Design a protein around this ligand. Structure first.
Ligand SMILES: CC(=O)SCCNC(=O)CCNC(=O)[C@H](O)C(C)(C)COP(=O)(O)OP(=O)(O)OC[C@H]1O[C@@H](n2cnc3c(N)ncnc32)[C@H](O)[C@@H]1OP(=O)(O)O
Ligand SMILES: CC(=O)SCCNC(=O)CCNC(=O)[C@H](O)C(C)(C)COP(=O)(O)OP(=O)(O)OC[C@H]1O[C@@H](n2cnc3c(N)ncnc32)[C@H](O)[C@@H]1OP(=O)(O)O
Length: 290
């Protein structure tokens, strides 16, 4: 009649039940929390997943991801048909001993936008940022009659330029020599470099999977931005992926203002999911939820 499972690895039947519950939530809520499926199905060091069943139906799911030194990210969903019955409190109560054993001090929850804003505010959660999970599902290419840039695959010889771009455009990173040495020697990644008048102006990364292409780390030096070069470089990458037979092109954009999306949506990407991220000190959550 009620069952709580805690494990360190989602199996195939559980993943399908979680995916169906997330789809039911998406239909009512307009979006979902961010789940990291590749971590769900890995054998993780601790029992980070919590499943709640009632009469053989999955009604709640929580997972925690230990991304930071003293904080973790939590993805939590409860069936729309069974809310305000304390299922999320049960899920959180179940994972709490582990959060304590890891001495977590703050929790970061991903949430669909808008529907929770009023009570998250009133309970002292703090809005941090948003993430737009974007997909381009058409197969039609970008028509570019007047290309301005020369674009080629980056090689090991380009690592100083790649690092220079990264330093100028991604302050939140900081040991990129080793990383680029790994990316440039891995058949599943293609790094593209953009040049204008024989000067390197920016770069973009494609990660190839069996059926998808993922774009990331797109960057143009600040002094060179706002001329259309970033859009042309992304257009080039789209057209490469289309000739490679992937039927899904994806990318994620972390931003606190929607204006950043214009670059991607003008080239056919659409918002497959949006999550906001909200942070709370753990002792505070304990008291507000008992
Ligand atoms: C901190 C977070 O939980 S962020 C959640 C992010 N996830 C999502 O938004 C996914 C979609 N939403 C859901 O799945 C759910 O509505 C959750 C997961 C938000 C709540 O699941 P539930 O099982 O309904 O929550 P539960 O019944 O345990 O309530 C716990 C407390 O949360 C608060 N709460 C939950 N839903 C609401 C709501 N709609 N309005 C106001 N407060 C709410 C209340 O404090 C509630 O305690 P109370 O009933 O004592 O006031
Ligand atoms: C999927 C991902 O790669 S997310 C990572 C995105 N990259 C970064 O945030 C690194 C810093 N940003 C940059 O390097 C550049 O701003 C880029 C690569 C995002 C765009 O380069 P640009 O040559 O300026 O692109 P372009 O000239 O075609 O147009 C800029 C558009 O991108 C958006 N944009 C501008 N600056 C930024 C920025 N710092 N971060 C994100 N988006 C931006 C704007 O909405 C703008 O559209 P507008 O014409 O309505 O103003």
């Amino acid at each position: 009649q009620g069952m709580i499972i805690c494990n360190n690895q989602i199996d195939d039947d559980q993943l399908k039940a979680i995916q169906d519950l997330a789809s039911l939530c998406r239909e009512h809520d307009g979006g979902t929390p961010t789940f990291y499926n590749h971590l769900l199905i890995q054998k993780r060091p601790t029992e980070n997943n919590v499943l709640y069943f009632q009469d053989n139906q999955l009604l709640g799911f929580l997972s925690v991801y230990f991304f930071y030194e003293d904080a973790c990210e939590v993805s939590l969903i409860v069936s729309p048909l069974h809310r305000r019955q304390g299922i999320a409190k049960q899920l959180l109560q179940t994972i709490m001993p582990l959060l304590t054993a890891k001495e977590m001090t703050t929790l970061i929850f991903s949430t669909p936008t808008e529907i929770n804003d009023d009570w998250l505010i009133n309970q002292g959660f703090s809005y941090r940022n948003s993430e737009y999970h974007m997909q381009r599902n058409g197969y039609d290419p970008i028509f570019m009659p007047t290309p301005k840039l020369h674009i080629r695959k980056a090689t090991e010889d380009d690592i100083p330029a790649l690092c220079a771009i990264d330093e100028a455009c991604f302050p939140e990173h900081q040991n990129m020599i080793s990383r680029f040495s790994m990316l440039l020697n891995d058949a599943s990644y293609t790094l593209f470099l953009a040049s204008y008048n024989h000067i390197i102006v920016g770069k973009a990364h494609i990660h190839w999977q069996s059926k998808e292409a993922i774009f990331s780390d797109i960057a143009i030096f600040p002094q060179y931005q706002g001329q259309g070069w970033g859009g042309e470089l992304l257009s080039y990458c789209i057209n490469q992926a289309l000739t490679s037979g992937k039927n899904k092109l994806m990318l994620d954009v972390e931003t606190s203002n929607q204006n950043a999306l214009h670059l991607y949506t003008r080239l056919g990407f659409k918002t497959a999911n949006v999550s906001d991220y909200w942070v709370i000190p753990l002792p505070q959550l304990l008291t507000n939820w008992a």
